[PDB]
Amino acid sequence: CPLMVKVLDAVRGSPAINVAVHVFRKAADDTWEPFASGKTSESGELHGLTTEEEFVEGIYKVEIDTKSYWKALGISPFHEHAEVVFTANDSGPRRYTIAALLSPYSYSTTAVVTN
Amino acid sequence: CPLMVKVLDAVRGSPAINVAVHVFRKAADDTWEPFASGKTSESGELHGLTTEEEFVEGIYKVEIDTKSYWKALGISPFHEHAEVVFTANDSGPRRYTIAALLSPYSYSTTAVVTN
Amino acid sequence: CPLMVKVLDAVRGSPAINVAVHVFRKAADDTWEPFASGKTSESGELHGLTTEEEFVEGIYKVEIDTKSYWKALGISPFHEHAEVVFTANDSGPRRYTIAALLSPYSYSTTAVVTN
Amino acid sequence: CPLMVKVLDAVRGSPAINVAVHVFRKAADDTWEPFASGKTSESGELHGLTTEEEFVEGIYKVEIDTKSYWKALGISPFHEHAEVVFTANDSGPRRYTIAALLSPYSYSTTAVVTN
Numbered sequence: 001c002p003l004m005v006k007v008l009d010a011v012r013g014s015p016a017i018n019v020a021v022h023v024f025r026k027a028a029d030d031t032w033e034p035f036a037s038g039k040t041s042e043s044g045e046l047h048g049l050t051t052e053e054e055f056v057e058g059i060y061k062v063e064i065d066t067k068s069y070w071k072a073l074g075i076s077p078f079h080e081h082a083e084v085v086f087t088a089n090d091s092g093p094r095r096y097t098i099a100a101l102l103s104p105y106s107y108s109t110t111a112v113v114t115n
Numbered sequence: 116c117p118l119m120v121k122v123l124d125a126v127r128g129s130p131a132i133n134v135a136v137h138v139f140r141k142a143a144d145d146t147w148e149p150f151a152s153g154k155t156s157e158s159g160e161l162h163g164l165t166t167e168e169e170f171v172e173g174i175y176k177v178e179i180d181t182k183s184y185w186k187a188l189g190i191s192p193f194h195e196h197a198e199v200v201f202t203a204n205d206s207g208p209r210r211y212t213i214a215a216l217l218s219p220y221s222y223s224t225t226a227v228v229t230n
Numbered sequence: 231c232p233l234m235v236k237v238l239d240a241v242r243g244s245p246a247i248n249v250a251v252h253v254f255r256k257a258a259d260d261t262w263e264p265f266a267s268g269k270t271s272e273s274g275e276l277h278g279l280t281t282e283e284e285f286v287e288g289i290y291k292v293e294i295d296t297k298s299y300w301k302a303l304g305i306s307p308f309h310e311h312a313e314v315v316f317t318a319n320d321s322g323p324r325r326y327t328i329a330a331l332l333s334p335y336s337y338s339t340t341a342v343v344t345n
Numbered sequence: 346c347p348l349m350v351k352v353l354d355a356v357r358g359s360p361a362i363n364v365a366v367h368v369f370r371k372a373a374d375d376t377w378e379p380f381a382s383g384k385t386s387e388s389g390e391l392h393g394l395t396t397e398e399e400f401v402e403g404i405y406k407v408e409i410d411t412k413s414y415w416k417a418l419g420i421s422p423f424h425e426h427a428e429v430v431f432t433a434n435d436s437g438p439r440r441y442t443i444a445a446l447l448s449p450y451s452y453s454t455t456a457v458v459t460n
């Protein structure tokens with residue numbers, strides 16, 4: 001599993017469940033092409049977005065739909081989404097975990113990159 | 116000043132100086148139009164991006180050029196940029212401060228919205 | 231002002247107003263001696279804790295009374311307080327800003343150390 | 346496993362490995378008593394600190410020895426440690442994950458609390 005997304009809720013102290021995630025890959029013409037999508041599980045995790053074969057070198061954008069999440073809990077939040085934009089695999093295949101910690105007017109994101 | 120950007124460096128414990136910032140407004144055709152830009156000061160701040168008159172309700176994107184900042188310090192970073200996307204809503208008088216705290220593989224962002 | 235504390239609220243998108251802050255210095259017997267205290271202002275800031283003369287090298291603890299802040303907003307929080315413990319080192323002239331970004335189950339803290 | 350600690354490195358984009366963690370529990374006389382200790386694994390995780398039987402209601406302090414960690418990588422960091430202080434089990438047994446994301450002059454911490 002070369003690309004995993006983990007989302008936590010800093011208000012509830014819980015995984016952020018049923019958070020929609022859209023992944024895009026920049027195409028040769030500099031447009032964002034849809035790559036993969038899914039939603040976080042009861043553990044706040046999203047696995048199975050892509051495969052080692054399909055996850056080639058490129059610039060990827062991980063869009064985490066935080067506004068839809070907060071709205072469903074009665075919070076009118078600040079951000080539309082949290083966007084994580086990075087070059088992947090440019091020194092060969094790596095495994096990437098994109099983690100996000102959400103609050104209504106703030107978020108933090110990190111990456112864990114393993115060989 | 117309706118819109119200020121503040122950038123801090125979590126590796127040096129300092130303001131993040133000379134960081135390029137680009138602000139975009141979402142157009143009717145759902146494309147991102149350039150709106151304002153500049154470079155953070157010696158205090159990590161960027162003021163004077165826009166005016167009360169021009170900063171109407173809409174969806175805005177603040178792109179912080181973190182990759183060039185880390186490259187200038189000789190540190191390999193993860194992200195291409197940090198992106199903060201939000202709706203500006205006129206409910207009363209308000210000032211938006213977008214703050215970001217940068218690390219090579221992580222960032223934190225918050226909004227300080229005041230009257 | 232050698233030592234300033236700044237507190238932000240990640241749920242409201244605001245300064246964290248009227249937060250009690252206690253500063254301690256580590257004594258020779260390895261106990262924490264009260265040093266300075268106060269409450270954040272309407273801008274989330276606490277100035278005037280100490281002087282250049284009194285703020286000598288040593289180990290300091292900044293305790294931020296987050297639990298009382300969340301209780302006053304009717305929100306169940308995780309932590310008893312947020313604690314920032316650091317050594318003050320005289321290398322050149324410097325000002326320490328301790329910043330904290332609060333959520334009910336999370337906090338972020340950074341140091342901005344300037345000349 | 347009712348108390349787990351997870352530590353990430355925001356500079357390297359990796360688990361924070363071999364981070365020492367000390368847990369204390371406030372005694373009736375308001376002193377901190379040693380409760381448990383250990384170090385993070387190659388995954389940045391510390392399991393097996395306590396048992397459901399021993400982890401009774403109380404105020405706990407999780408001290409993460411971040412200064413020792415950074416010093417071993419050639420970084421003179423700001424903080425002495427990251428301290429996470431909380432009341433545990435006061436509505437019955439819960440499972441607690443204390444997560445921390447480290448930078449030289451900053452850290453973020455959150456808790457995931459499950460029934």
Ligand SMILES: *C(=O)c1cc(/C=C/c2cc(C)c(O)c(C)c2)cc(N(C)C)c1
Pocket residue numbers: 006097099100101108109110112351442444445446453454455457
């Ligand atoms: C898996 O990698 C993982 C990660 C985390 C925590 C991530 C995290 C912590 C903090 C303090 C942040 O600011 C960010 C952005 C991420 C937790 C877990 N759990 C819940 C076991 C797994």
Ligand SMILES: *C(=O)c1cc(/C=C/c2cc(C)c(O)c(C)c2)cc(N(C)C)c1
Pocket residue numbers: 121123212214215216223224225227236327329330331338339340342
């Ligand atoms: C003014 O608004 C301001 C803000 C801050 C710090 C911001 C900040 C801290 C932490 C811990 C974060 O995680 C985030 C995202 C933002 C500091 C200052 N200074 C430098 C006076 C001013």
